[PDB]
Design a protein around this ligand. Structure first.
Ligand code: HEM
Ligand code: HEM
Ligand SMILES: [C-]#N
Ligand SMILES: [C-]#N
Lengths: 154, 154
């Protein structure tokens, strides 16, 4: 869990990010699929795409970006309610294990990608205090998602 | 395995990286450790470094960077001799499996990082025919390292 200052520093960041949630989610997923093509495999929509400029344009990927961003949104907006953050990531985890059958490690890879993009987008307003704050939310998603994978028996 | 055209493409690309192997290896390791803090954990000598400027400047992180580029150069310089590269990568696999006790997925994460660092530094000499070529070398490396981990029973 986080403080009130770390929570506020993360939400202020996410405030800007989510202003153009579509164009940010897309930069994230395109980099995820370019730098880790093994991640595409899980996606019947994208598994046959190699051109990154083709991914930027594709409507289904934009539909997928929104979907991730929006779920992340519910987490960031509820960091004050640890019963809410728990319950949301429980659901994301379980569904990714049971329906999507995704190897839990990719959540770690995706996280790092989210850091790289955020670090480029917001270089001039990403001080040490905010980096650590963001590292704390990363660890939070990861250990809640992995407990769901454990709970379901992976 | 790569064709004669794909081999030369990788080599012409690698000749540019390796012209300043220290600087490039350092750039790679630093991003690796920042976006994947859990990779740091493995290194007794770096697990407590947090400031990226502090890393660039440390002689020991420089030395480790020259060790990676050093080994990679031997793979790349020998891409005509597949028994040769098969041997080097298996040696690298078994060492990291048995002596360093590094989990094998970290090799995929590092390559991903190598691709993003190369894209940033050498955009001008990284056209789609080379992107495509480099991606095959990556798949070679990984499956020869996966095989090394399996041969040893991980
Ligand atoms: C921050 C972490 C993540 C969040 C919040 C997230 C969110 C979502 C949401 C909300 C959906 C749609 C609802 C559903 O069917 O479950 C979805 C679908 C999906 N997710 Fe994720 N996701 C995350 C990470 C990942 C990762 C790392 C992968 C593996 C590459 C992945 C693979 C998939 C797949 C294959 C689908 C189905 C897409 C389809 O309908 O074809 N997710 N995700
Ligand atoms: C194919 C890419 C890689 C190459 C060419 C490479 C090369 C090397 C070399 C030459 C050494 C020193 C000699 C030795 O003991 O083998 C070394 C040490 C080491 N490597 Fe790697 N490595 C690679 C990937 C990785 C990855 C992905 C990790 C994950 C964290 C890793 C972790 C380590 C550790 C913990 C050591 C020992 C550190 C020490 O000297 O105290 N390596 N590597
Ligand atoms: C991922 N969606
Ligand atoms: C790895 N050094």
């Amino acid at each position: 869990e986080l403080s009130e200052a770390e929570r506020k520093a993360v939400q202020a960041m996410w405030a800007r990010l989510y202003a153009n949630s579509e164009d940010v989610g897309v930069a994230i997923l395109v980099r995820f699929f370019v730098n880790f093509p093994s991640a595409k495999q899980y996606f019947s929509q994208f598994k046959h795409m190699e051109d990154p400029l083709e991914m930027e344009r594709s409507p289904q990927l934009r539909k997928q970006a929104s979907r991730v961003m929006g779920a992340l949104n519910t987490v960031v907006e509820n960091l004050h309610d640890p019963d809410k953050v728990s319950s949301v990531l429980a659901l994301v985890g379980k569904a990714h294990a049971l329906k999507h059958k995704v190897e839990p490690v990719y959540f770690k890879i995706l996280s790092g990608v989210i850091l790289e993009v955020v670090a480029e987008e917001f270089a001039s307003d990403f001080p040490p205090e905010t980096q650590r704050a963001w590292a704390k939310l990363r660890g939070l998603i990861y250990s809640h998602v992995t407990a769901a994978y454990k709970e379901v028996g992976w």
